[PDB]
Design a protein around this ligand. Structure first.
Ligand SMILES: [K+]
Ligand SMILES: [K+]
Ligand SMILES: [K+]
Ligand SMILES: [K+]
Ligand SMILES: [Mg+2]
Ligand SMILES: [Mg+2]
Ligand SMILES: [Mg+2]
Ligand SMILES: [Mg+2]
Ligand SMILES: [Mg+2]
Ligand SMILES: [Mg+2]
Ligand SMILES: [Mg+2]
Ligand SMILES: [Mg+2]
Ligand SMILES: [Mg+2]
Ligand SMILES: [Mg+2]
Ligand SMILES: [Mg+2]
Ligand SMILES: [Mg+2]
Ligand SMILES: [Mg+2]
Ligand SMILES: [Mg+2]
Ligand SMILES: [Mg+2]
Ligand SMILES: [Mg+2]
Ligand SMILES: [Mg+2]
Ligand SMILES: [Mg+2]
Ligand SMILES: [Mg+2]
Ligand SMILES: [Mg+2]
Ligand SMILES: [Mg+2]
Ligand SMILES: [Mg+2]
Ligand SMILES: [Mg+2]
Ligand SMILES: [Mg+2]
Ligand SMILES: [Mg+2]
Ligand SMILES: [Mg+2]
Ligand SMILES: [Mg+2]
Ligand SMILES: [Mg+2]
Ligand SMILES: [Mg+2]
Ligand SMILES: [Mg+2]
Ligand SMILES: [Mg+2]
Ligand code: NA
Ligand code: NA
Ligand code: NA
Ligand code: NA
Ligand code: NA
Ligand SMILES: [Zn+2]
Lengths: 39, 248, 97, 50, 76, 49, 70, 93
RNA sequence: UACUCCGCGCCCCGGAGGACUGAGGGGGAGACGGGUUCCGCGGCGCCUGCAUCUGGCCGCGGGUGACUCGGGCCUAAGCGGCGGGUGAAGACCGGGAAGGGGCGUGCCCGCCCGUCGAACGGGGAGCCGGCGGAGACUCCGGCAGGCGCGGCCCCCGCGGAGACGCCCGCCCCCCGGCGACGCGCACGGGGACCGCGGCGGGCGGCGCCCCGGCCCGCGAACGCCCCGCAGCCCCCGGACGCCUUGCGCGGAGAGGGGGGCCCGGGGGCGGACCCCGCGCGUCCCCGGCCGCCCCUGAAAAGCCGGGGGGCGCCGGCCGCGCGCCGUACCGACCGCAGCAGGACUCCGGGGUCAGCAGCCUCUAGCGCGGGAGCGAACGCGGCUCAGGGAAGUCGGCAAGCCGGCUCCGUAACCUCGGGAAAAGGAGUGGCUCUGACGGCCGGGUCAGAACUGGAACGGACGCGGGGAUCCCGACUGUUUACUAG
RNA sequence: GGAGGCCCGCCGCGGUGCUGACGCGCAGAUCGCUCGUCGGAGCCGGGCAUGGGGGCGAAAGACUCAUCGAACCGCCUGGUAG
């Protein structure tokens, strides 16, 4: 010439990473805390 | 209901003053031995614009009296002050516009600015653009002096409190209309997050005591008592009267 | 050639004030990119904000010692006009004082 | 990406070295019935999260 | 790379500062049958163009066995 | 404007007109009085004579 | 082998914790020869690779053959 | 006044804000765009830089003044009062 | 929008033909995310919604090199720590606290955190040519830069009337500078691109013409010498003058004459055995001005200068050295998928034109959930239609009319700014001519005339229908992501 | 000469009408024409801050990861039911 499918296309950030104590992909990269083991 | 706008402001977050790129806190020179006996001389170096503030600020350089070098101050500029001028502070400062001296040595009828309520607090009374105080009378027996505030109220202060001769520069600022919504936007973008303003009668009951109804209206009287608890104190607080009386 | 379009030379492609290039032809008949470095300001007067004569617009580290000096008592800090006022002011004041 | 830390690079390295089949002489030495390794992954289908 | 004058050429060769000397005969265009002397030094490569081929023999013969010498004489 | 001013400057620098006449004609050119070089040239002869 | 013939260089696998100066020292001591420069690299599988270029007055081919690489 | 009868510099606003605002702006903007005599060299080269900051384009001296105009009447009255009160004190010490 | 013939098979490869994307690219590259998808050889059991000899599929082997590019350092908005304080705790809050160094062994100086936080901000220094199958500012060849360390020689300032110049001292205290900063219409300069003419080399077609068509003709970082407008400064001297598109400046010293400084630039010689001239425009950068703000448009590491004090070779030549980590490839990413959705940035030719619009195209890339026949109803997307002209319908919904440019002519009302493209008229192609505007050859534009075509010319494309009134809200702006603008 | 929360209009940013297509979809919100705005109270990227009876709101009970007139996860809990 939406809040669903089109909004899933704006995802290109990593919120969690690998924990150094449990290694489980739950370390918040901006809070600096692990959601699993609490490090 | 939920928490109101006034309750949310007090917790900081997005309601703090924007202080980035501000020159600093404007204050009188500190009181010391050298000017408790004589006078200290300084020079005006620049006249600058402070973000958020309506009045200009002056940078004044004084000699260092407890070592070597110089000391840089930051004053609120009185009207008529110019770059390269030399000013004095102390018990023996002369009666000129830029000088700082105690109120006991200032004759009645003089205009002063940046007055300090209690001795050695570095100014707090007439600091907004265009404002000034007046020295009304002295009382040598009690060592207190009476001044008149910009609001018109009269106050007694100790005779050892210092002030600056003149009135604050930038007078007349509020005589010009803002005219456009975009101008108010810039003005408040230099200060804090407080604009634009949504009326309470235009909300739902869950977030303001004035909201709700099949017509927009305040249900009850808008005058609330002095002892209303924090979520209740909206409208006119402890009003003595209302309306446009018209007389003095 | 019928196409003269190039590719970015830096780590990223965002065009900030330190990522400017110009184009030149190489001996192999190719179009290349060369950085345009920022030019620093030369020293400015203390009393006035004017520029001080005799010193080029290069970072002082890449100049010899003679190239960043002026042969005068306050050379490089204030101009000749500002030095006269200080000399006149000090003499006339200390004579009366 | 092309700009990674060595720590992430080392964990992805182990994933690649492990994506292998069961060797032929192992299948018959151990008399194995199931001959496929179900811990393999394919790049187009997986989410390694590493 | 920089240009060098004749007098401080064999001087440099005197202080044993040159590492090699190349002689090339230019015979096309503004380089009309003249020769270029290129001396490799620790920091720079120095080149001199004697106005005539004859001058080349004398100077090079004036530093023979003092610095190793090459010849090019491209004729294409 | 550039044509007219370069002509006037060349005439002044040859001492073909006094500085006062030069200033008057400069102002008249800035005032849109002359439409082309030819009209300026014949005006100068009239003023000179 | 083309590297050995052309640039006087040998390609070796080393421990990941090794740095260039110690690789140079170890190569000099274990194979009696001289080393000019070393370039290193960590491969996608996690090993460390070194490119060792010998000194100009050293024939890399004879050392390579002596160690059995040739 | 070849182009407008009365709007003057407020012609940049078209028809968008009303008569009272436009009249007040005419007065204030005319005042704030003007050139003022320098108190240190008697030349008309003072221009506004910020709300209460005025600079001379000749001598390069900066002054603190009013918004929209270099001087305000309250300031002149105050300076005269200070000057008067200064002399009376210096006669009797 | 789309394939066909032959080798050979609608889909792979080759040649030939015919088309498309159309420089905001179905082009060439990065950031993020993915994680081996990259390369070579082999293969068709799975997948490649048709086939397959193909493949991002399956098997076997390979592939990412840095003193100069980025990270590691700095600090932003922030976060953490802090003798302690508080709470049943977990924990949360925090300036009032005997809070470190140097030289070198004794003395001297000193109130009080962070090698946390930016692969876009700050930052000491890199260019050319060539080589592989997959890597290159990293390899090799050449030519340079920066920062250190070690030897040998090896010096504690002169010129000018002045602005300043010329050959290079360090440590402490204090005073400064650089780093270091908005937006805008215009105007000027440089570079790259683009076009025109000439000369040299190569090619195509040719029924008729053709010196009228196409392609090629290259020169980096770095070193030394000259030039560099505007700006700022020095000397003589003593004024209605100088000057911009616009301005602006002058007794606090103009014009004139003679000088100095800076200028991301240009020329010459080297690098390297350089076809010659000319011009409008486009993009990027820089310059001096002017305008705007109740808006004034970061910081620190690091580096340097000056004053005072205390000390003393500090440069030249020659040698060595420069650790750690990233580096392949992809819109192969997210939406349950090889999903018409979503997804940041860089480079940007020709013609028509006001134009980076629409339409056609060189370079580069490429024929995508398969084909054949037939030419019913009916649907989806389009086109034309006698006479009438809203009679249709809740309702002119939908479609149609108008539209570029030049000239003529424009009302009531009004906050005097508007209304206004009001309303409404006329012209516009091709060819052959005439005049006007610069410079010591160039350039386009504007105006006028004859002739001539089916009474035709903004010939495709692109591109307002207008008027008279009433209600509501002054106006630009915002809103119910997915039924209300 | 070149002002303006001025006008026509491309990319962008939005989302009027056809109540068009689709509605076992290409799609758990898309496609086509037509349309609004286009120097500003403009638009876009990254970093950072605010946490559930709390936040944030040019205000629609809107939004807070397909979930909002009170999110999601596990447990109390095999909660009670004329
Ligand atoms: K209000
Ligand atoms: K960084
Ligand atoms: K690479
Ligand atoms: K809740
Ligand atoms: Mg939702
Ligand atoms: Mg986002
Ligand atoms: Mg409501
Ligand atoms: Mg209530
Ligand atoms: Mg209602
Ligand atoms: Mg100099
Ligand atoms: Mg096409
Ligand atoms: Mg790539
Ligand atoms: Mg492949
Ligand atoms: Mg595979
Ligand atoms: Mg770097
Ligand atoms: Mg590095
Ligand atoms: Mg850090
Ligand atoms: Mg940077
Ligand atoms: Mg190198
Ligand atoms: Mg590659
Ligand atoms: Mg690569
Ligand atoms: Mg998922
Ligand atoms: Mg897609
Ligand atoms: Mg009807
Ligand atoms: Mg009917
Ligand atoms: Mg319609
Ligand atoms: Mg409205
Ligand atoms: Mg609107
Ligand atoms: Mg909706
Ligand atoms: Mg709607
Ligand atoms: Mg404007
Ligand atoms: Mg507008
Ligand atoms: Mg529909
Ligand atoms: Mg259907
Ligand atoms: Mg709370
Ligand atoms: Na073909
Ligand atoms: Na186009
Ligand atoms: Na508009
Ligand atoms: Na409601
Ligand atoms: Na239950
Ligand atoms: Zn953990």
């Amino acid at each position: 010439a939406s809040k669903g499918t089109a909004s899933f296309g704006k995802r290109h950030t990593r919120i969690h990473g690998s924990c150094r104590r449990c290694g489980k992909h739950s370390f918040h990269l901006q809070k600096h805390e692990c959601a699993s083991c609490g490090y | 209901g939920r928490r109101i706008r006034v309750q949310r402001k007090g917790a900081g977050s997005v309601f703090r003053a924007h202080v980035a790129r501000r020159l600093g806190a404007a204050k009188l020179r500190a009181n010391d031995f050298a000017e408790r006996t004589g006078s200290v001389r300084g020079v005006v170096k620049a006249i600058l614009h402070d973000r958020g503030r309506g009045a200009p600020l002056a940078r004044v350089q004084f000699p260092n009296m407890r070592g070597e070098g110089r000391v840089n101050e930051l004053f609120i500029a009185p009207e008529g002050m110019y770059t390269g001028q030399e000013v004095f502070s102390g018990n023996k400062a002369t009666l000129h516009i830029g000088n700082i001296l105690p109120v006991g040595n200032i004759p009645e009828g003089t205009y002063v600015c940046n007055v300090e309520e209690k001795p050695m607090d570095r100014g707090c009374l007439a600091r907004a653009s265009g404002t000034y105080c007046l020295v009304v009378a002295h009382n040598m027996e009690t060592n207190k002096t009476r001044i008149r505030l910009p609001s018109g109220q009269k106050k007694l202060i100790s005779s050892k409190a210092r002030a600056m001769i003149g009135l604050v520069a930038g007078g007349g600022r509020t005589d010009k209309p803002l005219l456009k919504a975009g101008n108010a936007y810039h003005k408040y973008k230099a200060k804090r997050n407080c604009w634009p303003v949504v009326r309470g009668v235009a909300m739902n009951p869950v977030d303001h005591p004035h909201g709700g109804g099949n017509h927009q209206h305040i249900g009850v009287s808008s005058c609330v008592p002095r002892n209303a608890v924090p979520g209740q104190k909206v409208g006119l607080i402890a009003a003595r009267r209302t309306g446009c009386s018209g007389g003095k | 050639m019928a196409d003269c379009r190039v590719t970015c030379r830096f780590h990223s492609t965002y065009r900030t004030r330190s990522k400017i290039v110009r184009y030149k032809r190489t001996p192999g008949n190719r179009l290349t990119s060369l950085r345009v470095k920022k030019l620093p300001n030369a020293p400015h007067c203390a009393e006035t904000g004017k520029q001080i004569h005799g010193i080029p617009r290069v970072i002082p580290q890449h100049l010899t010692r003679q190239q960043r000096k002026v042969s005068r008592p306050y050379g490089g800090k204030l101009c000749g006009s500002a030095l006269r006022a200080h000399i006149l002011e000090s003499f006339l004041n200390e004579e009366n004082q | 990406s092309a700009n990674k830390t060595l720590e992430r690079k080392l964990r992805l390295g182990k994933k690649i070295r492990m994506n292998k089949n069961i060797p032929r002489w192992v299948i018959l030495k151990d008399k194995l019935k199931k001959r496929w390794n179900y811990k393999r992954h394919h790049w187009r289908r997986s989410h390694l999260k590493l | 790379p920089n240009t060098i004058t004749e007098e401080n050429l064999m001087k440099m060769i005197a202080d044993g500062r040159g590492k090699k000397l190349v002689v090339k005969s230019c015979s096309k265009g503004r380089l009309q049958g003249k020769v270029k002397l290129k001396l490799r030094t620790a920091k720079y490569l120095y080149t001199l163009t004697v106005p005539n081929a004859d001058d080349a023999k004398s100077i090079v013969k004036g530093c023979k066995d003092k610095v190793e010498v090459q010849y090019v004489n491209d004729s294409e | 404007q550039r044509v007219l001013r370069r002509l006037l400057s060349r005439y002044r620098d040859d001492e073909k007109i006094d500085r006062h006449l030069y200033e008057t004609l400069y102002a008249k050119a800035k005032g849109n009085m002359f439409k082309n070089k030819r009209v300026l040239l014949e005006h100068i002869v009239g003023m000179q004579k | 082998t083309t590297q050995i013939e052309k640039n006087n260089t040998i390609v070796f696998i080393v421990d990941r914790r090794a740095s260039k100066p110690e690789i140079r020292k170890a190569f000099e001591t274990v194979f009696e020869t001289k080393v000019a420069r070393v370039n290193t690299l960590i491969t996608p599988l996690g090993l460390k690779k070194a490119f060792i270029r010998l000194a100009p007055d050293v024939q890399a081919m004879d050392v390579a053959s002596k160690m059995g690489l040739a | 006044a070849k182009r407008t009868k009365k709007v003057g510099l407020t012609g940049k606003y078209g028809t968008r804000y009303g008569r009272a605002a436009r009249k007040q702006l005419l007065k204030i903007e005319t005042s704030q765009k003007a050139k003022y005599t320098c108190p240190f060299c008697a030349k008309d080269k003072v221009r506004r830089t910020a709300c209460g900051i005025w600079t001379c384009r000749s001598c390069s001296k900066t002054m603190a003044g009013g918004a929209y105009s270099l001087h305000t009447e309250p300031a002149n009255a105050a300076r005269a009062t200070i000057r008067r009160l200064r002399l009376a004190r210096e006669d009797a010490q």
